[PDB]
Protein backbone atom coordinates (compact mmCIF):
# COMPACT_ATOMS: atom_id res chain seq x y z
CA UNK A 1 0.00 0.00 0.00
CA UNK A 2 1.04 3.55 1.07
CA UNK A 3 2.79 1.40 3.77
CA UNK A 4 5.31 0.01 1.13
CA UNK A 5 6.23 3.58 -0.03
CA UNK A 6 6.91 4.91 3.53
CA UNK A 7 9.38 2.04 4.41
CA UNK A 8 11.25 1.93 1.00
CA UNK A 9 11.39 5.77 1.37
CA UNK A 10 13.04 5.71 4.87
CA UNK A 11 14.89 2.30 4.74
CA UNK A 12 16.73 3.30 1.47
CA UNK A 13 16.58 7.09 0.74
CA UNK A 14 16.19 7.96 4.49
CA UNK A 15 13.18 10.38 4.48
CA UNK A 16 8.39 12.10 4.43
CA UNK A 17 8.03 13.68 0.90
CA UNK A 18 8.97 17.35 0.11
CA UNK A 19 5.51 18.05 -1.53
CA UNK A 20 2.06 16.37 -1.11
CA UNK A 21 2.03 16.43 -4.97
CA UNK A 22 5.47 14.66 -5.12
CA UNK A 23 3.82 12.00 -2.84
CA UNK A 24 0.63 11.54 -4.98
CA UNK A 25 2.70 11.49 -8.26
CA UNK A 26 5.07 8.73 -6.92
CA UNK A 27 2.03 6.75 -5.54
CA UNK A 28 0.34 6.89 -9.03
CA UNK A 29 3.56 5.68 -10.74
CA UNK A 30 3.66 2.81 -8.15
CA UNK A 31 -0.02 1.74 -8.85
CA UNK A 32 1.24 1.64 -12.50
CA UNK A 33 -2.29 1.61 -14.05
CA UNK A 34 -1.60 4.68 -16.26
CA UNK A 35 1.17 6.44 -18.17
CA UNK A 36 2.11 9.57 -16.08
CA UNK A 37 3.60 13.05 -16.82
CA UNK A 38 5.55 15.12 -14.22
CA UNK A 39 6.39 18.85 -14.73
CA UNK A 40 7.95 19.97 -11.40
CA UNK A 41 10.62 22.69 -10.82
CA UNK A 42 14.46 22.18 -10.56
CA UNK A 43 13.57 20.58 -7.12
CA UNK A 44 14.89 17.00 -7.77
CA UNK A 45 11.72 15.39 -6.19
CA UNK A 46 11.01 14.42 -9.87
CA UNK A 47 13.95 11.89 -9.60
CA UNK A 48 12.37 10.23 -6.47
CA UNK A 49 8.96 9.96 -8.26
CA UNK A 50 10.22 7.22 -10.72
CA UNK A 51 13.19 5.83 -8.65
CA UNK A 52 11.20 4.70 -5.54
CA UNK A 53 8.49 2.86 -7.57
CA UNK A 54 11.28 1.09 -9.61
CA UNK A 55 12.52 -0.65 -6.37
CA UNK A 56 9.00 -1.91 -5.47
CA UNK A 57 8.48 -3.13 -9.06
CA UNK A 58 9.47 -6.90 -9.16
CA UNK A 59 10.91 -5.97 -12.65
CA UNK A 60 13.43 -3.76 -14.54
CA UNK A 61 12.95 0.04 -14.92
CA UNK A 62 14.63 1.57 -18.05
CA UNK A 63 15.32 5.37 -17.72
CA UNK A 64 16.10 7.46 -20.88
CA UNK A 65 18.12 10.73 -20.42
CA UNK A 66 19.82 12.91 -23.08
CA UNK A 67 23.47 13.39 -21.90
CA UNK A 68 25.91 11.72 -19.49
CA UNK A 69 26.56 14.46 -16.85
CA UNK A 70 22.84 14.26 -15.82
CA UNK A 71 22.92 10.40 -15.56
CA UNK A 72 26.29 10.09 -13.75
CA UNK A 73 25.45 12.60 -10.95
CA UNK A 74 22.25 10.59 -10.09
CA UNK A 75 23.45 6.93 -10.58
CA UNK A 76 26.31 7.83 -8.13
CA UNK A 77 23.73 8.96 -5.45
CA UNK A 78 21.59 5.82 -6.20
CA UNK A 79 24.77 3.68 -5.62
CA UNK A 80 25.57 5.58 -2.34
CA UNK A 81 22.11 4.23 -1.21
CA UNK A 82 23.28 0.60 -1.94
CA UNK A 83 21.00 0.27 -5.07
CA UNK A 84 21.47 -2.12 -8.08
CA UNK A 85 21.57 0.73 -10.71
CA UNK A 86 23.44 0.56 -14.08
CA UNK A 87 24.35 2.99 -16.92
CA UNK A 88 24.53 1.94 -20.62
CA UNK A 89 26.33 4.85 -22.43
CA UNK A 90 28.80 5.14 -25.41
CA UNK A 91 31.45 6.47 -22.86
CA UNK A 92 31.67 2.86 -21.47
CA UNK A 93 34.56 0.32 -21.92
CA UNK A 94 33.68 -2.57 -24.35
CA UNK A 95 33.98 -5.05 -21.39
CA UNK A 96 31.74 -2.98 -19.00
CA UNK A 97 29.13 -2.72 -21.86
CA UNK A 98 29.18 -6.45 -22.76
CA UNK A 99 28.99 -7.42 -19.01
CA UNK A 100 25.72 -5.38 -18.62
CA UNK A 101 24.07 -6.51 -21.93
CA UNK A 102 24.76 -10.08 -20.64
CA UNK A 103 23.27 -9.22 -17.19
CA UNK A 104 19.98 -8.02 -18.84
CA UNK A 105 19.71 -11.27 -20.92
CA UNK A 106 19.79 -13.39 -17.66
CA UNK A 107 16.76 -15.01 -15.95
CA UNK A 108 16.72 -12.72 -12.81
CA UNK A 109 19.28 -9.95 -13.67
CA UNK A 110 21.41 -7.90 -11.21
CA UNK A 111 20.26 -4.54 -12.72
CA UNK A 112 17.00 -3.07 -11.29
CA UNK A 113 17.28 0.47 -12.86
CA UNK A 114 18.97 0.83 -16.32
CA UNK A 115 19.90 4.44 -17.34
CA UNK A 116 20.17 4.42 -21.19
CA UNK A 117 20.83 7.31 -23.67
CA UNK A 118 18.36 7.68 -26.58
CA UNK A 119 21.38 6.81 -28.86
CA UNK A 120 21.87 3.31 -27.28
CA UNK A 121 18.04 2.76 -27.05
CA UNK A 122 17.89 3.45 -30.86
CA UNK A 123 21.06 1.43 -31.83
CA UNK A 124 20.38 -2.07 -33.34
CA UNK A 125 23.28 -3.07 -30.97
CA UNK A 126 20.68 -3.14 -28.06
CA UNK A 127 17.31 -4.10 -29.75
CA UNK A 128 17.51 -7.93 -29.19
CA UNK A 129 18.26 -7.41 -25.44
CA UNK A 130 15.25 -5.01 -25.40
CA UNK A 131 12.93 -7.60 -27.08
CA UNK A 132 14.11 -10.54 -24.87
CA UNK A 133 13.49 -8.32 -21.75
CA UNK A 134 9.97 -7.52 -23.06
CA UNK A 135 9.44 -11.26 -23.96
CA UNK A 136 10.39 -12.48 -20.40
CA UNK A 137 7.91 -9.72 -19.21
CA UNK A 138 10.83 -8.29 -17.13
CA UNK A 139 10.21 -4.58 -18.03
CA UNK A 140 8.23 -2.77 -15.23
CA UNK A 141 8.57 0.95 -16.29
CA UNK A 142 10.04 2.99 -19.18
CA UNK A 143 11.07 6.53 -18.00
CA UNK A 144 11.82 9.61 -20.24
CA UNK A 145 13.70 12.32 -18.20
CA UNK A 146 14.08 15.79 -19.88
CA UNK A 147 10.90 14.86 -21.89
CA UNK A 148 10.77 18.51 -23.19
CA UNK A 149 13.64 17.43 -25.58
CA UNK A 150 10.86 15.81 -27.76
CA UNK A 151 9.23 19.23 -28.62
CA UNK A 152 10.49 21.88 -31.15
CA UNK A 153 8.42 24.44 -29.10
CA UNK A 154 10.78 23.39 -26.24
CA UNK A 155 14.19 25.06 -25.51
CA UNK A 156 16.26 21.82 -25.86
CA UNK A 157 14.90 19.77 -28.86
CA UNK A 158 16.72 16.42 -29.62
CA UNK A 159 15.56 14.47 -32.71
CA UNK A 160 16.68 11.19 -31.02
CA UNK A 161 13.76 11.68 -28.54
CA UNK A 162 11.26 11.45 -31.53
CA UNK A 163 12.24 7.73 -31.94
CA UNK A 164 11.00 7.13 -28.32
CA UNK A 165 7.31 7.16 -29.47
CA UNK A 166 7.81 3.90 -31.42
CA UNK A 167 9.71 2.54 -28.37
CA UNK A 168 6.82 3.23 -25.91
CA UNK A 169 4.49 1.40 -28.39
CA UNK A 170 6.84 -1.69 -28.52
CA UNK A 171 6.97 -1.79 -24.65
CA UNK A 172 3.15 -2.14 -24.49
CA UNK A 173 2.90 -4.15 -21.20
CA UNK A 174 4.91 -1.49 -19.26
CA UNK A 175 3.66 1.98 -18.16
CA UNK A 176 5.62 5.07 -19.39
CA UNK A 177 6.58 8.05 -17.15
CA UNK A 178 7.73 11.31 -18.78
CA UNK A 179 9.30 14.20 -16.76
CA UNK A 180 10.62 17.76 -17.35
CA UNK A 181 10.84 21.07 -15.39
CA UNK A 182 9.73 23.60 -18.08
CA UNK A 183 6.68 22.72 -20.26
CA UNK A 184 4.29 25.17 -21.98
CA UNK A 185 0.97 23.34 -22.69
CA UNK A 186 2.22 23.12 -26.37
CA UNK A 187 5.32 21.13 -25.15
CA UNK A 188 3.12 18.84 -22.90
CA UNK A 189 0.75 18.23 -25.89
CA UNK A 190 3.89 17.41 -28.01
CA UNK A 191 5.08 15.01 -25.21
CA UNK A 192 1.73 13.08 -24.93
CA UNK A 193 1.54 12.79 -28.79
CA UNK A 194 5.29 12.30 -29.71
CA UNK A 195 5.81 9.61 -26.94
CA UNK A 196 2.42 7.96 -27.96
CA UNK A 197 1.44 8.05 -24.20
CA UNK A 198 -1.69 5.94 -23.48
CA UNK A 199 -4.85 7.65 -22.07
CA UNK A 200 -5.53 8.22 -19.30
CA UNK A 201 -2.20 10.09 -18.84
CA UNK A 202 -2.05 10.97 -15.09
CA UNK A 203 -0.54 14.52 -14.71
CA UNK A 204 1.46 16.07 -11.80
CA UNK A 205 2.32 19.70 -12.78
CA UNK A 206 3.51 22.02 -9.90
CA UNK A 207 1.57 25.31 -10.43
CA UNK A 208 3.70 28.46 -11.16
CA UNK A 209 1.26 30.57 -9.01
CA UNK A 210 2.49 31.65 -5.51
CA UNK A 211 0.00 33.26 -3.03
CA UNK A 212 2.39 35.60 -1.10
CA UNK A 213 3.58 37.44 -4.32
CA UNK A 214 1.77 40.66 -5.49
CA UNK A 215 2.14 41.41 -9.25
CA UNK A 216 1.38 44.83 -10.82
CA UNK A 217 2.22 46.68 -14.10
CA UNK A 218 2.94 50.46 -14.25
CA UNK A 219 3.37 52.48 -17.53
CA UNK A 220 6.51 54.73 -17.59
CA UNK A 221 4.61 56.93 -20.15
CA UNK A 222 1.98 57.74 -17.40
CA UNK A 223 4.56 58.68 -14.65
CA UNK A 224 5.85 62.28 -14.04
CA UNK A 225 8.71 61.29 -11.61
CA UNK A 226 9.81 57.71 -12.45
CA UNK A 227 12.71 57.62 -9.88
CA UNK A 228 10.31 58.94 -7.17
CA UNK A 229 7.70 56.25 -8.07
CA UNK A 230 10.42 53.55 -7.59
CA UNK A 231 11.49 55.04 -4.18
CA UNK A 232 7.84 54.86 -2.93
CA UNK A 233 7.54 51.23 -4.23
CA UNK A 234 10.87 50.03 -2.68
CA UNK A 235 9.94 51.89 0.60
CA UNK A 236 6.39 50.37 0.91
CA UNK A 237 7.78 46.82 0.24
CA UNK A 238 10.66 47.26 2.78
CA UNK A 239 10.08 48.79 6.27
CA UNK A 240 7.12 46.42 6.99
CA UNK A 241 8.39 46.82 10.65
CA UNK A 242 8.89 50.65 11.00
CA UNK A 243 10.21 50.52 14.66
CA UNK A 244 13.26 48.57 13.23
CA UNK A 245 13.14 51.08 10.30
CA UNK A 246 14.03 49.14 7.09
CA UNK A 247 13.33 45.32 7.05
CA UNK A 248 14.20 43.01 4.07
CA UNK A 249 15.99 43.42 0.66
CA UNK A 250 14.96 43.78 -3.06
CA UNK A 251 16.05 43.76 -6.78
CA UNK A 252 15.75 46.28 -9.70
CA UNK A 253 16.29 44.78 -13.23
CA UNK A 254 17.45 46.73 -16.36
CA UNK A 255 18.42 45.75 -19.93
CA UNK A 256 21.27 48.36 -20.08
CA UNK A 257 24.32 49.07 -17.83
CA UNK A 258 23.99 52.94 -17.88
CA UNK A 259 20.35 52.51 -16.66
CA UNK A 260 21.67 50.28 -13.79
CA UNK A 261 24.44 52.73 -12.65
CA UNK A 262 22.17 55.83 -13.06
CA UNK A 263 19.17 54.10 -11.30
CA UNK A 264 21.28 52.88 -8.30
CA UNK A 265 22.45 56.52 -7.74
CA UNK A 266 18.92 58.09 -8.12
CA UNK A 267 17.44 55.56 -5.58
CA UNK A 268 20.39 55.97 -3.13
CA UNK A 269 20.06 59.84 -3.16
CA UNK A 270 16.24 59.62 -2.53
CA UNK A 271 17.24 57.73 0.70
CA UNK A 272 17.08 54.04 -0.46
CA UNK A 273 20.65 52.59 -0.52
CA UNK A 274 21.21 50.63 -3.82
CA UNK A 275 24.43 49.31 -5.53
CA UNK A 276 24.71 48.43 -9.29
CA UNK A 277 25.43 44.91 -10.74
CA UNK A 278 26.43 44.53 -14.45
CA UNK A 279 29.05 42.68 -16.59
CA UNK A 280 30.62 46.16 -17.20
CA UNK A 281 32.12 45.98 -13.63
CA UNK A 282 35.33 43.99 -12.83
CA UNK A 283 34.69 40.43 -11.41
CA UNK A 284 36.06 41.49 -7.94
CA UNK A 285 33.57 44.45 -7.86
CA UNK A 286 30.54 42.14 -8.62
CA UNK A 287 31.43 39.48 -5.92
CA UNK A 288 31.82 42.32 -3.31
CA UNK A 289 28.39 43.95 -4.16
CA UNK A 290 26.65 40.48 -4.04
CA UNK A 291 28.03 39.92 -0.46
CA UNK A 292 26.98 43.48 0.63
CA UNK A 293 23.38 42.77 -0.60
CA UNK A 294 23.51 39.17 0.82
CA UNK A 295 24.71 40.41 4.30
CA UNK A 296 22.13 43.32 4.11
CA UNK A 297 24.74 46.15 4.26
CA UNK A 298 22.77 47.22 1.10
CA UNK A 299 18.99 46.49 1.05
CA UNK A 300 18.58 46.93 -2.79
CA UNK A 301 20.59 45.71 -5.85
CA UNK A 302 20.18 47.16 -9.42
CA UNK A 303 21.23 44.43 -11.93
CA UNK A 304 21.26 43.27 -15.61
CA UNK A 305 20.81 39.62 -16.89
CA UNK A 306 24.15 38.65 -15.17
CA UNK A 307 22.48 37.94 -11.70
CA UNK A 308 21.78 34.23 -12.57
CA UNK A 309 20.56 33.54 -8.94
CA UNK A 310 24.00 31.92 -8.19
CA UNK A 311 23.14 32.52 -4.49
CA UNK A 312 19.42 33.54 -4.14
CA UNK A 313 17.85 34.90 -0.88
CA UNK A 314 14.76 34.09 1.31
CA UNK A 315 13.82 37.69 2.38
CA UNK A 316 13.58 39.30 -1.14
CA UNK A 317 10.34 41.28 -0.54
CA UNK A 318 10.44 43.10 -3.95
CA UNK A 319 11.64 42.61 -7.58
CA UNK A 320 10.97 45.67 -9.84
CA UNK A 321 11.56 45.32 -13.65
CA UNK A 322 12.61 48.74 -15.11
CA UNK A 323 12.57 47.30 -18.67
CA UNK A 324 10.37 44.44 -20.01
CA UNK A 325 12.26 41.05 -20.04
CA UNK A 326 13.01 38.92 -23.20
CA UNK A 327 10.25 36.36 -22.30
CA UNK A 328 7.27 35.70 -19.94
CA UNK A 329 9.46 32.84 -18.59
CA UNK A 330 12.41 35.29 -18.09
CA UNK A 331 10.16 37.68 -16.12
CA UNK A 332 8.63 34.69 -14.14
CA UNK A 333 12.15 33.26 -13.48
CA UNK A 334 13.56 36.74 -12.51
CA UNK A 335 10.53 38.00 -10.47
CA UNK A 336 10.32 34.47 -8.90
CA UNK A 337 13.54 35.33 -6.90
CA UNK A 338 11.09 37.29 -4.63
CA UNK A 339 9.44 35.94 -1.44
CA UNK A 340 11.23 32.52 -1.17
CA UNK A 341 10.55 32.83 2.63
CA UNK A 342 6.72 32.71 2.06
CA UNK A 343 6.23 36.18 3.72
CA UNK A 344 4.33 38.84 1.65
CA UNK A 345 6.38 40.34 -1.28
CA UNK A 346 5.93 42.71 -4.34
CA UNK A 347 6.79 42.03 -8.06
CA UNK A 348 6.40 45.12 -10.37
CA UNK A 349 6.81 45.48 -14.20
CA UNK A 350 7.44 49.05 -15.60
CA UNK A 351 6.20 48.72 -19.23
CA UNK A 352 6.94 51.16 -22.13
CA UNK A 353 5.97 50.83 -25.86
CA UNK A 354 9.43 52.45 -26.51
CA UNK A 355 10.97 49.49 -24.52
CA UNK A 356 8.64 46.86 -26.18
CA UNK A 357 9.87 48.06 -29.63
CA UNK A 358 13.67 48.30 -28.85
CA UNK A 359 13.62 44.70 -27.42
CA UNK A 360 11.41 43.45 -30.35
CA UNK A 361 14.18 44.88 -32.70
CA UNK A 362 17.00 43.28 -30.58
CA UNK A 363 15.13 39.89 -30.56
CA UNK A 364 14.70 40.18 -34.42
CA UNK A 365 18.45 41.08 -34.83
CA UNK A 366 19.77 38.14 -32.66
CA UNK A 367 17.27 35.69 -34.40
CA UNK A 368 18.34 36.80 -37.98
CA UNK A 369 22.04 36.26 -36.94
CA UNK A 370 21.15 32.59 -35.99
CA UNK A 371 18.95 31.99 -39.15
CA UNK A 372 21.92 32.93 -41.45
CA UNK A 373 24.32 30.80 -39.28
CA UNK A 374 21.74 27.90 -39.16
CA UNK A 375 18.30 28.24 -40.90
CA UNK A 376 14.47 28.29 -40.43
CA UNK A 377 13.67 26.60 -37.03
CA UNK A 378 10.27 26.38 -35.19
CA UNK A 379 12.36 27.69 -32.18
CA UNK A 380 12.77 31.12 -33.94
CA UNK A 381 8.91 31.36 -33.86
CA UNK A 382 9.00 30.57 -30.07
CA UNK A 383 11.60 33.35 -29.25
CA UNK A 384 9.15 36.05 -30.54
CA UNK A 385 6.05 34.09 -29.26
CA UNK A 386 7.62 34.01 -25.72
CA UNK A 387 8.10 37.86 -25.85
CA UNK A 388 4.59 38.62 -27.34
CA UNK A 389 2.95 36.81 -24.34
CA UNK A 390 4.73 39.24 -21.89
CA UNK A 391 3.75 42.38 -23.95
CA UNK A 392 0.19 40.93 -23.69
CA UNK A 393 0.75 40.43 -19.87
CA UNK A 394 1.29 44.25 -19.58
CA UNK A 395 -1.16 45.55 -22.28
CA UNK A 396 -4.23 43.42 -21.24
CA UNK A 397 -6.54 43.76 -18.17
CA UNK A 398 -6.99 40.56 -16.08
CA UNK A 399 -5.64 38.67 -12.99
CA UNK A 400 -1.82 38.99 -13.41
CA UNK A 401 -1.38 35.41 -11.95
CA UNK A 402 -4.00 33.86 -14.34
CA UNK A 403 -2.20 35.49 -17.36
CA UNK A 404 1.04 33.72 -16.21
CA UNK A 405 -0.90 30.43 -15.47
CA UNK A 406 -2.38 30.51 -19.07
CA UNK A 407 1.15 30.76 -20.59
CA UNK A 408 2.60 27.95 -18.36
CA UNK A 409 -0.63 25.86 -18.50
CA UNK A 410 -1.87 25.91 -14.87
CA UNK A 411 -5.45 26.05 -13.44
CA UNK A 412 -7.04 29.51 -12.80
CA UNK A 413 -5.28 30.55 -9.56
CA UNK A 414 -6.86 31.55 -6.17
CA UNK A 415 -5.63 35.22 -6.29
CA UNK A 416 -7.28 36.54 -3.02
CA UNK A 417 -6.52 40.31 -3.48
CA UNK A 418 -3.07 39.15 -4.75
CA UNK A 419 -2.50 41.49 -7.78
CA UNK A 420 -3.28 45.07 -9.06
CA UNK A 421 -6.29 43.96 -11.28
CA UNK A 422 -7.82 41.57 -8.64
CA UNK A 423 -7.43 44.35 -5.99
CA UNK A 424 -8.80 47.33 -8.06
CA UNK A 425 -10.11 46.34 -11.55
CA UNK A 426 -11.23 50.00 -12.21
CA UNK A 427 -7.75 51.65 -11.70
CA UNK A 428 -6.25 49.08 -14.17
CA UNK A 429 -9.01 49.95 -16.77
CA UNK A 430 -8.10 53.65 -16.12
CA UNK A 431 -4.30 53.04 -16.55
CA UNK A 432 -4.88 51.06 -19.83
CA UNK A 433 -7.40 53.62 -21.27
CA UNK A 434 -4.73 56.20 -20.15
CA UNK A 435 -2.03 54.46 -22.31
CA UNK A 436 -4.41 55.00 -25.33
CA UNK A 437 -4.61 58.84 -24.70
CA UNK A 438 -0.76 58.95 -24.30
CA UNK A 439 -0.34 56.47 -27.24
CA UNK A 440 0.66 59.64 -29.26
CA UNK A 441 2.29 60.90 -25.98
Amino acid at each position, epitope marked *: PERRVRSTLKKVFGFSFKT*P*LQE*SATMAVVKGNKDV*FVCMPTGAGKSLCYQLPALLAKGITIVVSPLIALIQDQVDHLLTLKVRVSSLNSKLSAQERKELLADLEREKPQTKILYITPEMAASSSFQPTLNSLVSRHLLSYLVVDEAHCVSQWGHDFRPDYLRLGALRSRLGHAPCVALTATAT*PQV*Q*EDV*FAALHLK*K*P*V*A*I*F*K*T*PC*FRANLFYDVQFKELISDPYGNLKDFCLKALGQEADKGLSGCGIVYCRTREACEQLAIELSCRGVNAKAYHAGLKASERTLVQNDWMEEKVPVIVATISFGMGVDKANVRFVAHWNIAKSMAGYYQESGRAGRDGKPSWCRLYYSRNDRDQVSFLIRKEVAKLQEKRGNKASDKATIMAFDALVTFCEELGCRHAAIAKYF*G*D*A*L*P*ACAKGCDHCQNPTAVRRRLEALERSSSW
Partner: nanobody, 124 residues
Framework: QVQLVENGGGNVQAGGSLRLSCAAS????????MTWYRQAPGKEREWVAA???????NYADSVKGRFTISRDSAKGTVYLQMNSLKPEDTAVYYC???????????????????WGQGTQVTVS
Protein backbone atom coordinates in the same frame (compact mmCIF):
# COMPACT_ATOMS: atom_id res chain seq x y z
CA GLN B 1 -13.69 12.28 -12.80
CA VAL B 2 -15.07 14.26 -15.83
CA GLN B 3 -18.77 14.33 -16.88
CA LEU B 4 -20.06 15.01 -20.41
CA VAL B 5 -23.91 15.27 -20.43
CA GLU B 6 -26.16 16.35 -23.39
CA ASN B 7 -29.54 18.20 -23.39
CA GLY B 8 -31.78 20.11 -25.86
CA GLY B 9 -33.21 17.02 -27.60
CA GLY B 10 -36.90 16.24 -28.26
CA ASN B 11 -39.61 15.70 -30.94
CA VAL B 12 -40.09 18.30 -33.75
CA GLN B 13 -41.83 18.47 -37.17
CA ALA B 14 -39.97 18.28 -40.55
CA GLY B 15 -38.33 21.67 -41.41
CA GLY B 16 -38.22 22.34 -37.61
CA SER B 17 -35.23 23.35 -35.39
CA LEU B 18 -33.54 22.28 -32.06
CA ARG B 19 -30.36 23.42 -30.17
CA LEU B 20 -28.21 20.76 -28.37
CA SER B 21 -25.60 21.40 -25.59
CA CYS B 22 -23.14 18.88 -24.01
CA ALA B 23 -22.13 20.19 -20.53
CA ALA B 24 -18.55 19.43 -19.35
CA SER B 25 -18.14 19.02 -15.52
CA UNK B 26 -14.69 18.80 -13.82
CA UNK B 27 -11.54 20.97 -13.74
CA UNK B 28 -11.27 21.23 -17.60
CA UNK B 29 -8.31 23.32 -18.89
CA UNK B 30 -8.91 22.43 -22.58
CA UNK B 31 -10.48 19.84 -24.93
CA UNK B 32 -8.33 19.26 -28.09
CA UNK B 33 -11.47 18.24 -30.09
CA MET B 34 -15.16 18.23 -29.03
CA THR B 35 -17.07 16.15 -31.65
CA TRP B 36 -20.88 15.74 -32.31
CA TYR B 37 -21.94 12.14 -33.28
CA ARG B 38 -25.48 10.79 -34.00
CA GLN B 39 -26.63 7.15 -33.62
CA ALA B 40 -29.69 6.01 -35.65
CA PRO B 41 -30.96 2.85 -33.82
CA GLY B 42 -30.04 -0.30 -35.88
CA LYS B 43 -27.46 1.67 -38.02
CA GLU B 44 -23.82 2.99 -37.79
CA ARG B 45 -22.72 5.98 -35.62
CA GLU B 46 -22.51 9.12 -37.94
CA TRP B 47 -19.89 11.92 -37.55
CA VAL B 48 -21.81 15.27 -37.57
CA ALA B 49 -19.57 18.22 -36.61
CA ALA B 50 -16.63 19.13 -34.31
CA UNK B 51 -14.84 22.21 -32.85
CA UNK B 52 -11.10 22.43 -31.96
CA UNK B 53 -9.63 24.29 -28.97
CA UNK B 54 -9.46 27.85 -30.49
CA UNK B 55 -12.85 27.60 -32.20
CA UNK B 56 -12.10 25.97 -35.64
CA UNK B 57 -15.34 24.20 -36.75
CA ASN B 58 -15.97 21.39 -39.31
CA TYR B 59 -19.31 19.77 -40.33
CA ALA B 60 -20.42 16.66 -42.32
CA ASP B 61 -21.48 17.25 -46.00
CA SER B 62 -24.97 15.80 -45.15
CA VAL B 63 -25.56 18.55 -42.44
CA LYS B 64 -23.57 21.43 -44.08
CA GLY B 65 -24.96 24.94 -43.24
CA ARG B 66 -28.13 23.38 -41.60
CA PHE B 67 -26.23 22.49 -38.37
CA THR B 68 -23.69 24.88 -36.68
CA ILE B 69 -21.56 24.35 -33.49
CA SER B 70 -20.20 26.93 -31.05
CA ARG B 71 -18.45 27.22 -27.63
CA ASP B 72 -19.67 29.73 -24.99
CA SER B 73 -16.00 29.90 -23.81
CA ALA B 74 -17.17 31.60 -20.54
CA LYS B 75 -19.82 28.84 -19.88
CA GLY B 76 -17.43 25.99 -20.89
CA THR B 77 -20.30 24.47 -22.95
CA VAL B 78 -20.67 23.67 -26.71
CA TYR B 79 -23.89 24.08 -28.76
CA LEU B 80 -25.17 22.38 -31.96
CA GLN B 81 -27.84 24.59 -33.64
CA MET B 82 -29.84 22.20 -35.89
CA ASN B 83 -32.25 24.03 -38.29
CA SER B 84 -34.05 22.64 -41.44
CA LEU B 85 -34.27 19.14 -39.79
CA LYS B 86 -35.43 15.98 -41.69
CA PRO B 87 -36.56 12.51 -40.47
CA GLU B 88 -33.03 11.33 -41.56
CA ASP B 89 -31.58 13.50 -38.73
CA THR B 90 -33.75 11.46 -36.25
CA ALA B 91 -31.07 9.87 -33.99
CA VAL B 92 -29.41 9.95 -30.53
CA TYR B 93 -26.85 12.82 -30.32
CA TYR B 94 -23.68 12.67 -28.10
CA CYS B 95 -20.17 14.29 -27.86
CA UNK B 96 -16.55 12.94 -27.83
CA UNK B 97 -14.18 15.03 -25.61
CA UNK B 98 -10.88 13.98 -27.34
CA UNK B 99 -7.70 15.16 -25.54
CA UNK B 100 -9.54 16.43 -22.41
CA UNK B 101 -6.76 18.07 -20.31
CA UNK B 102 -8.10 18.46 -16.72
CA UNK B 103 -6.03 19.99 -13.85
CA UNK B 104 -6.59 21.44 -10.30
CA UNK B 105 -4.32 24.04 -8.58
CA UNK B 106 -2.83 21.23 -6.34
CA UNK B 107 -1.07 20.06 -9.59
CA UNK B 108 -3.21 16.85 -9.60
CA UNK B 109 -4.88 16.29 -13.05
CA UNK B 110 -5.58 13.83 -15.94
CA UNK B 111 -5.79 13.64 -19.80
CA UNK B 112 -8.34 11.24 -21.35
CA UNK B 113 -11.23 10.97 -23.89
CA UNK B 114 -14.83 11.17 -22.52
CA TRP B 115 -18.19 10.28 -24.20
CA GLY B 116 -21.58 11.83 -23.26
CA GLN B 117 -24.87 10.12 -22.19
CA GLY B 118 -26.64 11.32 -25.44
CA THR B 119 -30.15 12.90 -26.12
CA GLN B 120 -32.95 11.22 -28.21
CA VAL B 121 -34.04 13.46 -31.19
CA THR B 122 -37.09 12.58 -33.35
CA VAL B 123 -38.11 14.42 -36.59
CA SER B 124 -41.71 13.51 -37.74
Amino acid sequence: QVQLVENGGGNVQAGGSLRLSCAASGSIFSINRMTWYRQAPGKEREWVAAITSGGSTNYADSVKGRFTISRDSAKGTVYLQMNSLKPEDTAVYYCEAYGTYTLAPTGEGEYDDYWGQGTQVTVS
